[PDB]
Design a protein around this ligand. Structure first.
Ligand SMILES: Cc1cc(N2CC[C@@](C#N)(C3CC3)C2=O)cc(NC(=O)Cc2ccccc2)n1
Ligand SMILES: Cc1cc(N2CC[C@@](C#N)(C3CC3)C2=O)cc(NC(=O)Cc2ccccc2)n1
Ligand SMILES: O=C(C[C@H]1NCCC[C@@H]1O)Cn1cnc2cc(Br)c(Cl)cc2c1=O
Ligand SMILES: O=C(C[C@H]1NCCC[C@@H]1O)Cn1cnc2cc(Br)c(Cl)cc2c1=O
Ligand SMILES: [Br-]
Ligand SMILES: [Br-]
Ligand SMILES: [Ca+2]
Ligand SMILES: [Ca+2]
Ligand SMILES: [Ca+2]
Ligand SMILES: [Ca+2]
Ligand SMILES: [Zn+2]
Ligand SMILES: [Zn+2]
Ligand SMILES: [Zn+2]
Ligand SMILES: [Zn+2]
Ligand SMILES: [Zn+2]
Lengths: 467, 484
């Protein structure tokens, strides 16, 4: 790897994602191939989150990719299919940018009584938003994989409960799987989903860019969509009266992998948190009778490790040098390299090198390796945490806000929350700073006025430059 | 209640069964359907099995883009021209024309193989074995049918490249055998492995292998999955090539395979096993294998009966049986019976107060309807045994059905008679496109298509035997019939 993360972050990022064999470019802008090394991380995320939402009663299903004009405009850079071969469709049809308008008519038909609620459905699928701004692999693409969950309840408080549960699962994905610290909160009036009541969100910070990025989102839709699509049930108490269902929706994408790359990656390449590493430990070999024995010693380690449920690969290819293999698996971010040399074989001991720090370490010919893995995870998280702690500070006045913002940090400011003030904050700080979230647990507690002067502060709000 | 008979109007029965089992919901765009959880969980079971099996072969999962540029789609002879009117084109985003229109993938060769060519710089870069689960689109005007033939559908498509022919040949048959395991072992559906004829194979490939299944309610056959050897056709098209230094001065074009399997599986499961009470789920893929329902419904006694149903639920989960306790006050027990029968749940566990007070329950089989009174303490064992026996039974019945409806015939006379009887036929066949066209055209006065050239035909072909056309010698016994 040539480019340096602190010099030329875009070039560093492209080189990391391709030389780690995560991404390949497609001949259509903003579309990328997810190679197995990237996809396996998505598979790990999927296994965790799918089990967890199943524990909450959510069922998986698959709705059509195509949205009619009427369904879509029953409420915009949607991709329109307008012909098959050379012959025009009777009416153009749209590729889903999200599936509310595909799902909620079906919900309306399935709900007859309050006995039919709640409905909790999730799908793992692809969506398309065909914007013409600059794409970035993983972080912001035209086609992407995600999961979208869509719930409908009889009451408001079970919906609110789910909203917070799903947000906490997203925070778990980032913090426990990817070792990325996030700040939970809710979007401002300006930035919230216009189709919902409130939008909760997890925001992560990428310091090499000094920019924030949304990691996931969980919306309380309230009765907005149920009144739109007539998702109604009869009142269990009052004859002949109908109630509109309360709804949530929530989503999470492969952006995860990009954030994991941006946060933990270094100038040797990818750095994989052991919890999502497709390969946690790579075994590399360093008298011909002796050579055969060495290979057999590696296979011994491999089988043992496989037996202790550690994801492991023995790279015994004859065609490549050990130093080549060292660099290959470092670039890919394998948390531990296990080096087996003849002396050490003879000494019945071995060497383990951790990817995060490079700390080498000799050990006796199972237990240790697992112990190293966990520490690597903790290490990654705590460093990311310190980075966030360094780059997220309080400022009580605009001038202090601006200086700090220009130092490449994100700032919690007292904020009145009006949309006009938020646009003013954007252009005065000019790209300009946007609102990220109103944090659940702000750093310091809030008579204080907004940084606009004209109005009092309603809440500490986190602002920053953002992807 | 279903109130439509499978032996009368098969189409209406199918529609009723897939909707009333809560498998399918209709969409306002023809040929696209909502897969509700009851069916999507069957696809997820198939997925878990096939994923595990291909990983043991060294296949890795990935995800390539859904959009194909016009240049990449039209670049090589990847597919015949007759497919052109069935490609769906995105021509605008919002209100603004795209400079170049882009196509939705009907299959991903034109997206993957330029990448494969970039990735093969030497022998060490082979083999490449990649699979993806994803949706594809084929915008046909022919009458769609849920699960069986739709405009959008879910599938897996595997694409692999090798240094030698032997490796690729081996994988083709391994994957075909995996598809046969999906059908016979998970779905309880017997299939016939074989080779597609010249007319019916994938045109740009060297040969296509296939598994064919029979639907006796319709007298038709349908292809369950496919596994192609491409040889070096696509690698010479896309320049997926390396150099062996021990063979200076010769290119080595990769040998490739591709293979595919869709949600048609579920449709075939519905058509083979479904009866006049609704769906019938093979225990192996049933989302719920056992549903516990309280019957015969004092306040203390009611509390106790519900606790007992939950005891059964706990024990069944603890021995890895997928179980649902239907404890809803809103619906009658006889309605619960009907509802879970429509959905095809293999076993219904009835618990009444008299049975609770004698430590027993009733188990009712979905496939036969047979009722058994079972002692409480044997719940885990008996119920497991019964599930296995349901699986077996379904497969056995279907195989019996296949074996009576597939027979050998040696003349166009016998062939057309047996064909008209609603069966499929293994005939001696010369293999030529003209003569297959002729077989179809004649036997209409729809015509019979070829299904597959079986690896293991019923009867070995006689030497010098001539194909039913009488003009050419038979090259092989070939399974023909009316088809989906
Ligand atoms: C990969 C990815 C992710 C996401 N988004 C959105 C919010 C969200 C979060 N959190 C989803 C709710 C879960 C997320 O991840 C969004 C996107 N593309 C786009 O906006 C389209 C686009 C394309 C090119 C340039 C500019 C914009 N692309
Ligand atoms: C559900 C499903 C399945 C399959 N096919 C194909 C062969 C194969 C097998 N075996 C694939 C290799 C895996 C299969 O299952 C094909 C399809 N639609 C279509 O052709 C498009 C269409 C749309 C409306 C009416 C008629 C035709 N729809
Ligand atoms: O997609 C959403 C709302 C939520 N849906 C379920 C998963 C989580 C997700 O945030 C917001 N959104 C975002 N981008 C969009 C782009 C287009 Br184009 C359209 Cl039509 C609609 C939308 C649109 O509704
Ligand atoms: O899709 C195939 C060949 C194989 N691709 C890999 C997975 C298994 C599959 O059988 C054949 N086929 C089928 N239908 C098609 C429809 C269209 Br539209 C196009 Cl352009 C092309 C095709 C086309 O190539
Ligand atoms: Br969104
Ligand atoms: Br196909
Ligand atoms: Ca055709
Ligand atoms: Ca053009
Ligand atoms: Ca490789
Ligand atoms: Ca030559
Ligand atoms: Zn992998
Ligand atoms: Zn203000
Ligand atoms: Zn289910
Ligand atoms: Zn007793
Ligand atoms: Zn002939």
């Amino acid at each position: 790897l040539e480019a340096k993360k602190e010099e030329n972050l875009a070039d560093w990022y492209s080189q990391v994602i391709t030389k780690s064999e995560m991404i390949e470019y497609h001949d259509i802008s903003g579309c990328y191939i997810l190679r197995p090394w990237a996809y396996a991380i998505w598979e790990a995320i999927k296994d965790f989150f799918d089990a967890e939402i199943k524990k909450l009663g959510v069922e998986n299903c698959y709705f059509p990719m195509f949205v009619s004009q009427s369904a879509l405009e029953k409420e915009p850079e949607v991709a329109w299919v307008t012909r098959s071969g050379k012959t025009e469709l009777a009416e153009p049809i749209a590729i889903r940018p999200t599936s509310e308008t595909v799902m909620y008519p079906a919900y309306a038909k399935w709900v007859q009584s309050h006995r039919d609620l709640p409905i909790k459905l999730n799908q793992w699928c692809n969506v398309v938003r065909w914007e013409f701004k600059h794409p970035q692999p993983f972080l912001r693409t035209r086609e992407f994989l995600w999961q979208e969950g869509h719930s409908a309840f009889a009451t408001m408080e079970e919906a609110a409960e789910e909203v917070l549960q799903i947000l906490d699962l997203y925070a778990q994905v980032y913090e426990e799987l990817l070792a990325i610290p996030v700040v939970k909160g809710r979007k401002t009036e300006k930035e919230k989903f216009a189709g919902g009541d409130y939008t909760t969100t997890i925001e992560a910070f990428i310091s090499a860019s000094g920019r924030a990025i949304q990691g996931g989102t969980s919306h309380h839709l309230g009765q907005n969509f149920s009144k739109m699509f007539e998702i109604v049930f009869e009142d269990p108490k009052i004859p002949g009266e109908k109630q509109f269902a309360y709804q949530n929706s929530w989503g999470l994408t492969t952006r995860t992998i990009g954030v994991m790359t941006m946060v933990h990656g270094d100038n040797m390449g990818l750095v994989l948190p052991p919890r999502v590493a497709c390969v946690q430990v790579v075994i590399i070999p360093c008298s011909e009778e002796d050579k055969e024995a060495l290979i057999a010693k590696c296979n011994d380690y491999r089988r043992r490790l496989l037996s202790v449920n550690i994801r492991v690969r023995a790279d015994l290819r004859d065609n490549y040098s050990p130093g080549w293999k060292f660099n290959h698996w470092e670039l890919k971010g394998v948390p531990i390299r296990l080096e087996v040399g003849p002396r050490d074989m003879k000494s019945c001991q071995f060497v383990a090198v951790r990817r995060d720090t490079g700390e080498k370490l000799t050990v006796a010919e199972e237990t240790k390796l697992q112990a190293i893995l966990e520490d690597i995870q903790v290490t990654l998280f705590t460093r990311a945490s310190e980075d966030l702690k360094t780059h997220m500070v309080v400022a009580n006045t605009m001038e202090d806000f601006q200086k700090i913002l220009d130092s490449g940090k994100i700032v919690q400011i007292p904020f009145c929350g009006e949309i006009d003030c938020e646009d003013w904050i954007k252009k005065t700080t000019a790209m300009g700073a946007k609102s990220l979230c109103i944090p659940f647990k702000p750093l310091c507690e809030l008579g204080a006025k907004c940084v606009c002067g004209k109005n009092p502060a309603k809440y500490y709000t986190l602002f920053g430059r953002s992807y």
